Structure formats: C-alpha cells, structure tokens
Amino acid sequence: NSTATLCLGHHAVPNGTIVKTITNDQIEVTNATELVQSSSTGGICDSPHQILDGENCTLIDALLGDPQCDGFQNKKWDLFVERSKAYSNCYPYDVPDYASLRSLVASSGTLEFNNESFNWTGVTQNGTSSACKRRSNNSFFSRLNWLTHLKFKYPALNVTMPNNEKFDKLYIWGVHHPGTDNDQISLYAQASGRITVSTKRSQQTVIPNIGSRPRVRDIPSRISIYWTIVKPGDILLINSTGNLIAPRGYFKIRSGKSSIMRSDAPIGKCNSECITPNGSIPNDKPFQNVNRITYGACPRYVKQNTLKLATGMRNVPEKQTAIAGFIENGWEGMVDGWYGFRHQNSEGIGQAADLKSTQAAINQINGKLNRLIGKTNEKFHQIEKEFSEVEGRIQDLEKYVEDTKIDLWSYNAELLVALENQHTIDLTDSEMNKLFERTKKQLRENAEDMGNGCFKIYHKCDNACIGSIRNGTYDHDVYRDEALNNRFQIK
Amino acid sequence: NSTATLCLGHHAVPNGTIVKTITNDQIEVTNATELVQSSSTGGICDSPHQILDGENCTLIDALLGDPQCDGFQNKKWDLFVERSKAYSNCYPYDVPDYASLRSLVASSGTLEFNNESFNWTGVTQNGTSSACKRRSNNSFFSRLNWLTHLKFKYPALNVTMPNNEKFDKLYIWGVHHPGTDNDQISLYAQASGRITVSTKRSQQTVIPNIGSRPRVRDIPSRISIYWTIVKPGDILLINSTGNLIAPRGYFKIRSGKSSIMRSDAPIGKCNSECITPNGSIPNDKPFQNVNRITYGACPRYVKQNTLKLATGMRNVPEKQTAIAGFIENGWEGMVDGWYGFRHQNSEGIGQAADLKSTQAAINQINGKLNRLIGKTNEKFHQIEKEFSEVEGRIQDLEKYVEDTKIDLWSYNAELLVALENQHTIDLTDSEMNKLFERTKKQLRENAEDMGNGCFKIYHKCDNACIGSIRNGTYDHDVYRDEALNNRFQIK
Amino acid sequence: NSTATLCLGHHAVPNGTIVKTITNDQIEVTNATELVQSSSTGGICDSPHQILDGENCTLIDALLGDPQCDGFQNKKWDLFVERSKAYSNCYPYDVPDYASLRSLVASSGTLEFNNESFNWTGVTQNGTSSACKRRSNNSFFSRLNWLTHLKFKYPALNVTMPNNEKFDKLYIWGVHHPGTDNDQISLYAQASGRITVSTKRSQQTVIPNIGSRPRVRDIPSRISIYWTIVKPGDILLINSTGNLIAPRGYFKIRSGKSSIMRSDAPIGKCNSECITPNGSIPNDKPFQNVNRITYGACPRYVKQNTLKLATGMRNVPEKQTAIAGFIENGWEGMVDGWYGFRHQNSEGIGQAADLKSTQAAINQINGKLNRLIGKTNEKFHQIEKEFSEVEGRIQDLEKYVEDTKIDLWSYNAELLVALENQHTIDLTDSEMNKLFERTKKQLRENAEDMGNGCFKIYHKCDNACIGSIRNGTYDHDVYRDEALNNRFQIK
C-alpha cells in the first residue's frame, strides 16, 4: 500500500554443529570438519614405501644371519617392521648398546653384505652349534666365522683389511665367552686373552670372560657382538689369541630416509603415505591422535581426540511467525544461497539468494581448508617412544623430549582452531553486514532501517524494482519525490 | 525546550592498570589479573602427595641401608625430598651411573625389600666395618652381605635365584676394591678375580681393582655398586671367586607417578597440589616463574615475572565540564554498571546502567578466566634440571632441552595474553557500539546523532519516555509528527 | 551548482608487495619488510666476542699441547673456531668420550694451566718421540709427562696432589698402549698393569692393552686420554706400575658463556653480535635461515627463506576516469599522506592529506616494527647439530631435539606474521573507516552518502568551508536551512 519491505538475511540449518572459538567455548555453526584423525584401517599398506616385514626375525637377527632369517639377505627397506612374536634361534648373544646398532642399521636401510677373503691361516674356520641349526644341521650365524684351534694350536692373529673403496664399511664381529675353563681349552687351546680391533682413528679391546650363564638352548656360553666402521683410505686390524667370532666381510652403510617400527599390524596390498604401529592412516587432516610413533607424510600427533573447524556461519534459529531480517534470526527456508533478500510488495512475498556474498564466504572458507587439509610433512627415522626395559637417565630424557613436543603441538592445535573459527564467524558475519550496508547505500533517502535487518521502502516497488536493488542497478532518483512525500508527511 | 538529549556511555575508574595488547605495548584498562605465579610460602605441603623427607639420607643411602636410614625401610612415596645436608656414614662407595639408579628407584616410588635365602655355603657372611656403625657396633649396609673366606678358603660361588613371581625383581649388589694386596688375602684368601652376574637375557662382569684411594672414614678401599633386574621366568646367576658384596634379596620395582626432588624447604602440615624446590605454590594461575623444577598439578614455567590479563574495558578519563557520551570519554560516576545512559530532559539530568550490555561483557570475561584459571596439568618424574658436576655431552643435551622448552612456553604465554587482551578490548568496545546502534535504530527519524555518543531527540521526552528507550519499548510513531516538524523546520 | 562533493580516500602505489594474512594467502600491500635473514657476509667478525681461531689445531690438540699449538698456551675465548683443515701432528691418541671433553673445555673458555711439582722419584721423566717433533727435535705433548723406567726399575707410583685452592682443578692424563711386548719391557721394565686415578668421591681404573694398531707417523702404539676434576678440599691420588702418561699440573675450569664452532669462514676486522659457521649475520630481523648453528645475540633459525611483514595498507588500483572515494579505489596521486580528502566545489577540484589518520597508522606500524626488529636474545654453548660419524641413540636424540625445535619455531614465525599482517590490514582499513565516520557526523543533515566513499553536500561549500570540515570546525547549523531546502525539495 504505497510501500514495500526488503529484508536481508542468511541461511540456517536444522542440524548444526558445535565448535570452539576465542569468544565462545561452544557456538553452533552450520557445518564443521574434523581436524584430528582418530582411526586407522588396522593394516600397514605396502605402498608407496618399501616395507620389510621381519616376521619371526629382529633386524639384528637378520643382520647377524640367524638361519630363519636367511631369506632377508641383502634386502633393503624404507621401513623394517619388527613383530612382537619375533624370537632368536641361534647361539645366545648380547649386543652392548644393542639400541644403537639397531638404529644405525635401521637408518641405513640395507642389509647388503660383501664377502671378504681374510687370512685365517693357522686356525680352524666355520665352527657350528646345535643351538643354531640350518636345514637340520648344526650351523652358525651366516655372516660370522667361529674360529677355533688347529691341531691344538691357535697362533696370534694379526690380520689386516684395507678399505680401498669410496664408501664406508660396517664390520660386525664378536667375542665368545665360554661357560667353563674346559670349553676354553677345548676350543682355543689356551687361556683366554683380549681381542683388539682397530683402525687408524679408533680402537676397541674386549676381554673374554669365562663363566656359567643360565642355559639358553642348552648353552651356558655367550657371544658379545661389536661393530666397527672403516672409512675410505683407512684399514681394519684384527689382533687376537682366541675367542674371536670373526667377520666374513662388511655391510654397506647408506644414508637416507629408512627406519624401523614395532608393530603387529598386518601388511596389506593398499597405498597410504602415513604408517603408524596401529596401521596406516589417511593424511588429509593436519593432526592425529592414533599414535605418537609415525613414518612418512603424517598428521602431527596431538592429545585431543577431536578438533572441529567451522566451515559455515553461526547457526541461528528462525523466530516463529511479517517477514524479518537477520537480527537474531536465520532463514531455514533459504537453501540456494548463504545470504539473500526477502521482500514484500504489491505482487507478494519473495526470496532470492545473493550470489556474490555467498561465494565470498565460501571461497574464504575453502582457502583455509586448502591450507590445513592435505598439507602434512614427512618424518622418517626419529627416536624410540616406547621401551620394554627400565634404563634411567637416557630414557627419562627421550620420554621428556617427546612429552614436551606433544604438549606444544597440542597447544598449537587448540589455539589454531580457536583462532580460525573466530575468524570464520567474523568473516561470515561481515558478509551479512556488508550486504546490508550496500543495500542501505543504494536506497539513499527512499527507505528507513526498521531495526530488524529490513528496510521500509517508501514507494511502490514492484518485482522489477526489487530486482534492480538486488542487482545493484536501482536508481534512487527515479523514486525520491514519491518516497520523500511518503516519509515526511504529517499524519 | 521541545527536545531532549540521550547519551550512551561506559564506566571508568580512578585506578586503572596497564596491560599489553597486539595494538598497544601499554594500554590502561579498568582491571586486570596476574597470570604468573611468582611467590611460594616457602614450605612443601605434606598433602595431598605422599612426601618422604630424606633428612640426612640420600635415596641411594636409604636403598643400600646406611644405618642412619634404617627408619626408611620399606617406605613408599610420591615425592622423595633430598636435602643438601645429606651425608653418607657407612662404607665408602660409588655407583657407576649413580644418576640412573637414583632415577629408576625414584620413579618406582618404593623401598619394599623381600629377603631371599641365597646358598652361601663355604664362606663367612655378614662382614662389618668401623666405617659403618649401627648402635655403636661395627656394622654394614642392611641390604648387602659382605662375604669373606671361611677357614682361609673361598670356594667358587655359582649361585642361582629364580624369579617365580609375576613381578620384576631389582637386585642391588657390589664389588669390594681392597686398598692393598694384604687386605685381599686377609679377606678372600686369594688373588682378585672377576664377578659375573647374569640372567638369560643379560650379563655383567666386574673386575675388582686393588689399590689405595684417599681415605674416607679411615678406609682406602671402595665398594662399587651395581644392579640387575630379573623378569618373571628368568633367573639370577651369581658367579664369583671373591670380592662379592652380595644381595640379601630384592626390591620390588613398581611403575607409577613417583619422583625425587632436591630441596631444603621445610615440610609443612598444609595442602597444595604443586611442589617446587622453593616450596609449594598455588596453581590457580596458568604460568609461574618460581622454579623450572616442579611436581604435581603445576602452572607452566615461563621467564616473565608478570603477565597481566585484562578483566575490564579500556579506562578513559572523563573530559572536564552539558552531558556527553562515550566518544573519547568515560564516566567515573557510573558505578552500578559498565555501560549506560545519561539524559537531559524537562525533568532534569539522569543516569541509568544498561544491564544487558554490562552482563554480556562480564560473562565473556568470566569465560576466558574460567579457561585460564585453575586448569593446570600434572607432571611427575621428569629430567634433572640442575647439576652439581661437570659432565659434557649428556648434560649439554638435558640443559638445551629444558631451555628450548621454556623459551617456547614463554613465547606462547606472551602471545596468548596479548591476543586475549586485544580480544577483551574488542568485545568491550563492541558492547558499547552495539548499545549505541540499538538505540539509534529505535529512534528512527525522531533523533539525530550529535557526534559525541549522544542523540538529540527532537521531541519532548519525559522520564517515562526516556525509560521506554532504555527498556526497548519506545514507539517512534507516537512522536514522529512532532519530531519531524522540529527537525525539518526553517529557522 | 548549489552543491559540492567531498570524497574520502587513501593512497596507493604503483609497486606493491604481496604478503600473507589469515584472510588471504596473497594480498598486495603498499610496502613490506623482510623478517628472515638469509645472507651472511661470509666472514666471522672478530668483535665484540673474543674469537680464537684454531688454525691447524683442534681444541683438544691445543689442550694436550701438540707442538704446532704452542702459541695457544693459556689463552681464553668466547668462541673457539675449529677449521676443517685441522690435523694432529704428535703421538697418536684417542679420547674415550672425546665429545664430552671437547664440550666441557669449550664451555670453560680457557686453557690456563698451572704447573705442579709431582713426586716422580724412581722413574725417568720427559719421554719423547719422532712422531711429535718440536723445533726439529723429538718431543711430546707440552702438558703431559711420559714416564719410563729408571735403571730398568719402575717402582709402584702412589702419588698425591691436594687441592688447597678455592677453585676446581681439571687434570688431563693418559695411558700408553704399546705396540708390542718388547716395547712394554723396553719402556717400563715389566708386564703391563692397570692405572688407578682417584679422589675422595671418584675413581677411574684403566688397563693398558698391548697390541699393534695401524701405524700413524710410524707409531703402532696409542695413548688413551682421560680426565679428572678435583674439588677444593679433595685430593688427587695416582697409583700406577707403568704406562702412565702423567699430568704436569692442572687446567683452571671456569663457568661462563664460552663455546666452540666448526667453520671455515675467514675472521674479519668488523663488529657483529651474531656468529654462524657461514659468517656473522646482522641481527636486526627476528628470524634467519642461514644456519641452525649460532653463537651470540642471533635471530631464531626457521625453515622459511622469506617472511614478509606488511608495513602499509592494502594496495588498491585507482579505477579509470568525477572524483571518487575509497570504495574499491585507491589514489595513486596522493603522495603527502596515507589518507585524505578530495573535493569538488565552485572553486575547482582539490586534494589534501589527513595528518591525524596518517600518523595513527604509521605509529602503530612503527610500534610493531619496534617489537620485532633488533630484539634478538643471546645463546651461547648449546648442543652439536652436525656429526662426522655414525653413532646411533644419542645422536638420534640430539638430531630429533633440534628438528623438533626448528619446526616449532617455524610454525610460530608463520602464524605470527600472518596474525600481524591481518592486524595491519585491519588497523589501516579502520583508520579509513573512522575518517569517513567522523566526517559523516560533522555533516549532520547537510549531506548524503553517495555510496562510493563520497558525500554530496547540499549547499554551496567553498574552499574555506571544505577546509573547516577537514579541520573539524564545520558548523552544520550555519548551512542547515540551505541544505534542507536543497535535499527535501520536490523536482
């Protein structure tokens, strides 16, 4: 009746989701996406990383050449997977600083071994044992050479092996600790004497220690395992009078991205960049709470089991019912846009979405998704994060380093999502406010703000007229005389 | 005189506090709260954690059973407190990797000890010394057994102890290093020979080393202390020909939240969750600069000695004097609200607080206090952070880890408080602006904005009329004819 | 023609720079500054830190007193610089835990050495070798004393040295490992026997190990180096029957800010607070990507090679052409201010800068530059971050600690610059909006907002009138009758 109403509004949905911002612990938005990966398939995918399943073998057992590990000879890996069921089935041994040798071989990523012709003149080679059977026969570690007396003599060994290669050589060797004095004489024909293995730059002396240890596979003796790395132009010197478990050659030692993981997860024929002990996980999300132990391009481990990123505006119920605008009121009936117009005029009541404002909001939200989704970074060999034995100081430090790191990342994740969500609420509120202001400015003196997100337009404004406002081509001068007469009359 | 004035405003106080935001290094606000705890009472509260005051005993001395520590037998703790006055008063000893044994016992949290019947047939037991008196008599460590020759014989010991329990056993044992060859013969009846202590999975051999060390309590000999952990189903084997300081049994080893702290603070009868070497501290605040060493639910250590969180709006002086609104002007006379109205009309000049806006600001500020106050997280056994000896590499790493951590937290604290304070300034400014806008919209064409946070209302507006605006029930149509005539007249 | 136009605007430049905000991956601003230092001069400046260039000497060689290092005697440093060309030229030696002794001497920062008169009665002193020539003559390490038999006797040494000083003493000593049994007898007149060096609180026993090692300077023997620190009131006891390489006295050990760095950069006569292996770097910027290894007041190492901080507003092209204001439009022709006014009236078209708004923006931007520029913090002795040998566990941890730290700082840097840039865009947009609003409020009913950042002023407004608006002294009442007649006429 000589006027029209034009309301600005935004959509609302019946099934909103709660997120956290800086302003609110809980605010309902139209939509959100999860940023913490909390599940795994349960299998380790065999692609795209080269996986070596240790099965019954530890890495160190595959290194030394336990008979059940013969199939591992010379293999390489990106990730060596050690199973909890693994067990040793050869001569009982220990490795002082086992963890370091495991780590350096793991990180090298290869079991490539080159045989060398050592001069073992004057002794018997290839000693074997019933504790280490190969094909039903008494045998020994494939890569080691148990030397013993020859005709009750064991002449002093003083043997040399130059490295004339352009790469480093890793030598694995050992010392036999016999159970009794009888065994020492039976084996080496004399009282026990130290072993010295040296290079130009380093030396290691080891003393065999005769004595009973608890029997393992009926063996009260032990072998202790040692290693030496020899640089190009340097030379290995082995100097011994008995009890030497000699190397048969050297391992290549490489540098690269290889590592080792303890897991019982089955290996599957599938493709996934991120491996955890629980299985591979998708790496679309920036964070994960599956496992602190990871390999490959992985989300960062956090303590939270959920962090929701807002991907829509505040969700506001529609007040019950004349048309009304956005002030404390969303429009559940607007489904083809995020923002729009409702009008009442001589021709009826209508709605239309505003594409520009809708797309501006969507684009910005898609931008922040692009920065956070699918952007994980790769890590490879790290530190151990679970321990089967009590050790004290070094382990305390490894644990504290990891705890420190996780708490700092968890804090960053918490803040980032709160900040981002606050920004999303702000940018979507801003698009609504900007649409209102643009409309107010078009209308000039021809309308008044009713306080509810609507304008009272003080002239006849048919569908085409409303359309012109929505399209930004309304000419206020055309209607100003009519509007001013209607506004500034005296009733 | 046919018009009225209505001003919107906010409170101000005579005693503001300076805070830091993103926008300003220094901005005065009405109120702030401290987020860094910088004082302690000076006492360690004996509740709610179980405290064991070591008094004159170190943990290791209480473990071995120095006579002054007899009262500690079998005790447990959450926190063992070692005093700087502590001193050893038994046979002089050392512990290779003392720090690891201290840590693992500390973390276990128990001195529970179970005696075992070892077969020491063929030797003399219970050797004692004047360096270790108990009840005026020559004695020895309670948990160790000094074995010596019997009738000038010391037969080879080869003794076994199975672990048929479902828990791990910790064995503490030692090697006696005599001062002279005479002492070696006097004690063990033969030349010194190695000691080997083994299990199915591990072995340790130790060689006694005869020689003078500087006398301590007139003793030039030493004992070196070692330990072995034995798993269920495994067995301890002790193999020796002399110089054995034998175990009398095993310690339980537990897992849990126990630790150890160096402090001289007195223990008080009080209750506090957070313990530092300086004493317990309140844990209401999120940060603290009392000590990097903490136990329990503690604020995080930061370098800052103060960080002030704004808990009110910007504090703005009242300009000297017609009434005026919030533009560059606070109202020191408004004491029953944070925001409000002042008016001038035919009936006088008045003020009233606006409850809604005040409560909206207060609630949001209380929300952020709730997130930051009383929300500390517990940490228990960590790494050492002060050192009495120079050590090199491992200590360099422990120090760098802690320095790294503190700098990262200090940075997070600095940013968080700057961000939060900026947000508080923004939300309180926003409540003022929203109140102004709501009022502007009610008034429609009946008022004009004077530019100083006040409206000139162009009609007679008595106390009830002003009240209607404040209460949001003002009907602009009632007054529009009057107002339009007054506004758009020609003077 | 009875009206005027007044536009509000902001400057724009032809050569903008792209930065990152929270809202935009790429937004062009008028100006930016770099926060990551990415270059070095290539030289280490000799001021203000005390630099000691090791030249051909390692620290350990200068400690022991290799003849080519005689010039280093008693020197101090803030930073010891070790060169890759360095080489040893004396008796072949090793140091078990070399890295720890290097670190503790490096951190101490002094080679001050005090000679002491040990009682070496009964042996020959000052043994020398052709492997260690000094001034063409056979010689030895300056700080060590090679003792050998006297008249084919080597009586048991049992020598004492009390520390009656108020500071700690560092003793460096060694054990000679002869190449053959012949050398052992030639040198010490008897079979090899252990060396024991002790104090009241500690003990070290070392066993000489006879054997061939690969010849170095024709020497198949080795010396192994050890150290002992003696506290005030404690005493050094040296107990040996041969193979002792004895100390000639002690090194002072100090605490302070000294360290050691590997670098081949030349030392220059210049002044710079921050040293890296690549050379000194300026420390104005908060971050750097030159080297993770630093000494002194240094920017923090990050992975990014550039991070640009906005130092101006959004840069917006001027739309082509009536005058127009800031809505989607910058003014390339405004060069004496950041914000200003353009007008059209009876006297022409003019421009003037607004000083207040310009200065408000500049001051705030200068504030944030002041917080970020020239504010670096000092670090001194840290951990090693590059390694020439494979080691396993400890090295894995040192690497993981550093990687962790760098990733956390890189994240903080990324967020900080995004937040700061968002804040800069917001504060500069805000100054534009505030200027517009202040002007709108002055004009009251005498103007209408044209929607393009300009006002249509509905009265004659000559240069002085425009000036009054700009200066904030425009009196709207003077013109209101004229303006209202022009606005609310009927055409």
Ligand SMILES: CC(=O)N[C@H]1[C@H](O[C@H]2[C@@H](O)[C@@H](CO)O[C@@H](O[C@H]3[C@H](O)[C@@H](O)[C@H](O)O[C@@H]3CO)[C@@H]2O)O[C@H](CO)[C@@H](O[C@@H]2O[C@H](CO[C@]3(C(=O)O)C[C@H](O)[C@@H](NC(C)=O)[C@H]([C@H](O)[C@H](O)CO)O3)[C@H](O)[C@H](O)[C@H]2O)[C@@H]1O
């Ligand atoms: C080297 C050897 O075979 N040792 C056997 C050992 O042999 C001695 C024994 O037969 C006596 C009997 O009088 O004779 C000695 O020979 C002397 C001879 O009398 C004299 O004329 C001459 O001048 O001097 C020689 C000394 O050289 C024999 O030396 O017998 C004992 C008791 O039966 C064996 O102990 C048992 O070992 C069992 C495991 O057997 C192996 C194994 O591991 O499978 C056999 C391997 O061939 C042998 N390996 C090598 C490289 O020799 C190993 C090795 O000896 C041990 O593993 C070391 O711990 O033993 C099983 O452990 C059982 O429980 C033992 O009682 C011993 O092996």
Ligand SMILES: CC(=O)N[C@H]1[C@H](O[C@H]2[C@@H](O)[C@@H](CO)O[C@@H](O[C@H]3[C@H](O)[C@@H](O)[C@H](O)O[C@@H]3CO)[C@@H]2O)O[C@H](CO)[C@@H](O[C@@H]2O[C@H](CO[C@]3(C(=O)O)C[C@H](O)[C@@H](NC(C)=O)[C@H]([C@H](O)[C@H](O)CO)O3)[C@H](O)[C@H](O)[C@H]2O)[C@@H]1O
């Ligand atoms: C084991 C013992 O008591 N050792 C004494 C030692 O005893 C020898 C001495 O009396 C000579 C004298 O001729 O006789 C020897 O006996 C031989 C005998 O002649 C011969 O017939 C027979 O066939 O062989 C035996 C050898 O077994 C004795 O062995 O005397 C010296 C010098 O007086 C003592 O040194 C002094 O020790 C003082 C501390 O005394 C204790 C202690 O710590 O309290 C007494 C303890 O009972 C003893 N503990 C045990 C378990 O035996 C310890 C222990 O020996 C030391 O602590 C080891 O370092 O000593 C104090 O240190 C003083 O300064 C020393 O001069 C030695 O203890």
Ligand SMILES: CC(=O)N[C@H]1[C@H](O[C@H]2[C@@H](O)[C@@H](CO)O[C@@H](O[C@H]3[C@H](O)[C@@H](O)[C@H](O)O[C@@H]3CO)[C@@H]2O)O[C@H](CO)[C@@H](O[C@@H]2O[C@H](CO[C@]3(C(=O)O)C[C@H](O)[C@@H](NC(C)=O)[C@H]([C@H](O)[C@H](O)CO)O3)[C@H](O)[C@H](O)[C@H]2O)[C@@H]1O
């Ligand atoms: C101590 C010494 O000079 N050792 C020489 C060694 O001397 C023995 C040799 O001349 C025989 C010959 O019959 O005689 C021995 O003397 C005995 C004598 O016969 C007997 O009557 C008496 O009762 O007993 C003595 C034993 O004390 C000599 O002891 O000769 C060998 C072979 O020539 C030398 O080896 C060579 O060493 C070369 C390096 O020489 C130095 C060096 O480093 O410069 C000389 C230094 O003076 C010496 N330092 C000291 C403190 O003595 C060192 C030191 O011995 C070595 O470094 C230890 O490794 O050697 C070079 O290495 C060459 O390749 C070797 O063949 C040996 O040095």
Ligand SMILES: *[C@@H]1O[C@H](CO)[C@@H](O[C@@H]2O[C@H](CO)[C@@H](O[C@H]3O[C@H](CO)[C@@H](O)[C@H](O)[C@@H]3O)[C@H](O)[C@H]2NC(C)=O)[C@H](O)[C@H]1NC(C)=O
């Ligand atoms: C030191 O004490 C050890 C523990 O008592 C002892 O170990 C053990 O020796 C016995 C036999 O001497 C083993 O028992 C085996 O012997 C029969 C003999 O034919 C075999 O048929 C069986 O396999 C039987 O198990 C024990 O297994 C073994 N115990 C342990 C824990 O290792 C050492 O022999 C003693 N050492 C010396 C040098 O005497």
Ligand SMILES: *[C@@H]1O[C@H](CO)[C@@H](O[C@@H]2O[C@H](CO)[C@@H](O[C@H]3O[C@H](CO)[C@@H](O)[C@H](O)[C@@H]3O)[C@H](O)[C@H]2NC(C)=O)[C@H](O)[C@H]1NC(C)=O
């Ligand atoms: C190797 O040298 C050591 C240092 O000189 C020496 O240590 C000491 O020995 C003396 C006695 O021999 C102790 O002095 C004590 O002796 C009288 C004798 O009755 C007592 O009354 C007093 O208690 C007096 O203090 C020293 O205390 C002691 N010094 C140190 C630093 O330990 C060793 O005895 C020598 N070793 C050998 C095997 O000869």
Ligand SMILES: *[C@@H]1O[C@H](CO)[C@@H](O[C@@H]2O[C@H](CO)[C@@H](O[C@H]3O[C@H](CO)[C@@H](O)[C@H](O)[C@@H]3O)[C@H](O)[C@H]2NC(C)=O)[C@H](O)[C@H]1NC(C)=O
């Ligand atoms: C154990 O084996 C070692 C390696 O074969 C051996 O080392 C070396 O000994 C030879 C001489 O015996 C050195 O050669 C030098 O000898 C002549 C003799 O006049 C000199 O003119 C030259 O300097 C020549 O180089 C080797 O340099 C040396 N090789 C290494 C790698 O060190 C040991 O001698 C053997 N040990 C025993 C105890 O026999």
Ligand SMILES: *[C@@H]1O[C@H](CO)[C@@H](O)[C@H](O)[C@H]1NC(C)=O
């Ligand atoms: C909600 O958000 C996510 C991410 O933008 C999108 O993939 C999903 O389809 C959205 N859901 C709805 C119902 O719009």
Ligand SMILES: *[C@@H]1O[C@H](CO)[C@@H](O)[C@H](O)[C@H]1NC(C)=O
């Ligand atoms: C591993 O050992 C188990 C148990 O001894 C055996 O049954 C299984 O066949 C073994 N697996 C492989 C792959 O050798």
Ligand SMILES: *[C@@H]1O[C@H](CO)[C@@H](O)[C@H](O)[C@H]1NC(C)=O
């Ligand atoms: C090393 O070899 C030499 C002979 O070349 C010999 O005399 C010596 O005993 C050997 N050393 C050891 C520790 O076996």
Ligand SMILES: *[C@@H]1O[C@H](CO)[C@@H](O)[C@H](O)[C@H]1NC(C)=O
């Ligand atoms: C993965 O395994 C770890 C270690 O056993 C366990 O703590 C965790 O609950 C597992 N997580 C998932 C998602 O299966």
Ligand SMILES: *[C@@H]1O[C@H](CO)[C@@H](O)[C@H](O)[C@H]1NC(C)=O
């Ligand atoms: C200031 O703030 C704190 C925390 O909100 C509050 O406990 C205190 O009483 C306030 N002081 C005043 C004077 O309002």
Ligand SMILES: *[C@@H]1O[C@H](CO)[C@@H](O)[C@H](O)[C@H]1NC(C)=O
């Ligand atoms: C601890 O030792 C001191 C000094 O010897 C003694 O006076 C005090 O009584 C001792 N305290 C306890 C609790 O045994």
Ligand SMILES: *[C@@H]1O[C@H](CO)[C@@H](O)[C@H](O)[C@H]1NC(C)=O
């Ligand atoms: C261990 O016991 C055996 C006898 O069972 C003995 O012959 C041997 O000497 C002992 N070993 C040691 C190192 O004491």
Ligand SMILES: *[C@@H]1O[C@H](CO)[C@@H](O)[C@H](O)[C@H]1NC(C)=O
């Ligand atoms: C607590 O003790 C530490 C360590 O001695 C000291 O540096 C610090 O000043 C103390 N802090 C307080 C608040 O007493």
Ligand SMILES: *[C@@H]1O[C@H](CO)[C@@H](O)[C@H](O)[C@H]1NC(C)=O
């Ligand atoms: C741009 O910014 C920097 C830092 O404020 C300033 O030093 C430089 O001179 C500025 N450049 C221009 C062209 O204004």
Ligand SMILES: *[C@@H]1O[C@H](CO)[C@@H](O)[C@H](O)[C@H]1NC(C)=O
């Ligand atoms: C260091 O050694 C090189 C190569 O032997 C020599 O030429 C140079 O003069 C030496 N420099 C110094 C400072 O002694």
